[PDB]
Design an enzyme around this catalytic site. Sequence first.
Site, PDB file in Angstrom:
ATOM      1  CG  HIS A  20      -5.955  -2.242   1.184  1.00  0.00           C
ATOM      2  ND1 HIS A  20      -5.310  -1.851   0.034  1.00  0.00           N
ATOM      3  CD2 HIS A  20      -5.322  -1.631   2.209  1.00  0.00           C
ATOM      4  CE1 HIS A  20      -4.324  -1.023   0.347  1.00  0.00           C
ATOM      5  NE2 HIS A  20      -4.326  -0.862   1.658  1.00  0.00           N
ATOM      6  CB  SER A  75      -1.033  -0.070   1.119  1.00  0.00           C
ATOM      7  OG  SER A  75      -2.025   0.911   0.869  1.00  0.00           O
ATOM      8  CG  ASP A 135      -7.487  -2.563  -2.359  1.00  0.00           C
ATOM      9  OD1 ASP A 135      -8.040  -1.721  -1.619  1.00  0.00           O
ATOM     10  OD2 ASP A 135      -6.254  -2.817  -2.292  1.00  0.00           O
TER      11      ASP A 135
END
Length: 208
Positions: free
Chosen positions: A189, A103, A157
């Site tokens: 995610h 991320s 996600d």
Amino acid sequence: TFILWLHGLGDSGPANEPIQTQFKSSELSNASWLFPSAPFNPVTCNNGAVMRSWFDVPELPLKVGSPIDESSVLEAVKNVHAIIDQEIAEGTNPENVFICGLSQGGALTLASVLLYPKTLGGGAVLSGWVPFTSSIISQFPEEAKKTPILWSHGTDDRMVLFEAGQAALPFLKEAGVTCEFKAYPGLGHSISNKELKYIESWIKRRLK
């Protein structure tokens, strides 16, 4: 082999160190891993609350067209580059260096690899995004463009939208960088063990 892993927003290095235990192959058994921790910075998407954060994140979710912040990303790149510089100065072959991250740490992985003066073993982005505009492409060093990128993203996600990951492909084509994009249907995610095993296989193939 040196593997630098960059955690996501709010997280820490020690919290993620067990990721290395999913890389169970003989080939990666001798790898030197490093899981640094980002400084405590205010984070705009969290109303200025302070937490470990590589660079400021203005908005969630990350999408195509979501606002970002280049000077902040570059501060973080400077520190990642100091780590890589020192490992290479201690004798590691640059092509045996792999940068990975989740991320925010995946966005940082991308920026760090593309701005590094030497070709590295690879950059593995997990559920990241492109943290700058095409204005930076002119500054990517010649050898950085030869570093392979493996981008892994979950189709479901809703925190860093899958489309933000897909957007890396035309950006990287403009930049002259080779990227394999690996979609994970149904993944959100998070990191799955199968996603890590595929990264391990990619590192093994790069090492040859």
